Amino acid sequence: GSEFTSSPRGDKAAYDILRRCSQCGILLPLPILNQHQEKCRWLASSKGKQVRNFS
Ligand SMILES: [Zn+2]
């Protein structure tokens, strides 16, 4: 099988309100997530190397 959520990790009952970043590993509630969204977007936009696209 190739399923997920099948490995040992910490236990909590609030992982649905929190948000996590697949490239940063930090967890934010909601108002502090705005600072992550701007900075993580700026880095991901700036990280543009070996690019090639034409018609
Ligand atoms: Zn991030």
UniProtKB/Swiss-Prot annotation:
Tissue note: Widely expressed. Expression is frequently down-regulated in cancer cell lines. Isoform 5 is widely expressed. Expressed in placenta (at protein level).
Compartment(s) of residence: Cytoplasm; Nucleus; Mitochondrion
Domain of life: Eukaryota
Triggers of expression: Up-regulated by IFNB1/IFN-beta in cell lines sensitive to the proapoptotic effects of IFNB1 but not in apoptosis-resistant cells. Up-regulated by TNF in trophoblast cells.
Assembly notes: Interacts with BIRC4; the interaction is not detected in. Interacts with BIRC1, BIRC2, BIRC3, BIRC7 and BIRC8. Part of an complex consisting of BIRC4, XAF1 and BIRC5; the complex formation requires IFN-beta stimulation. Interacts with RNF114, the interaction increases XAF1 stability and proapoptotic effects, and may regulate IFN signaling.
Protein's job: Seems to function as a negative regulator of members of the IAP (inhibitor of apoptosis protein) family. Inhibits anti-caspase activity of BIRC4. Induces cleavage and inactivation of BIRC4 independent of caspase activation. Mediates TNF-alpha-induced apoptosis and is involved in apoptosis in trophoblast cells. May inhibit BIRC4 indirectly by activating the mitochondrial apoptosis pathway. After translocation to mitochondria, promotes translocation of BAX to mitochondria and cytochrome c release from mitochondria.
Name of the protein this chain belongs to: XIAP-associated factor 1
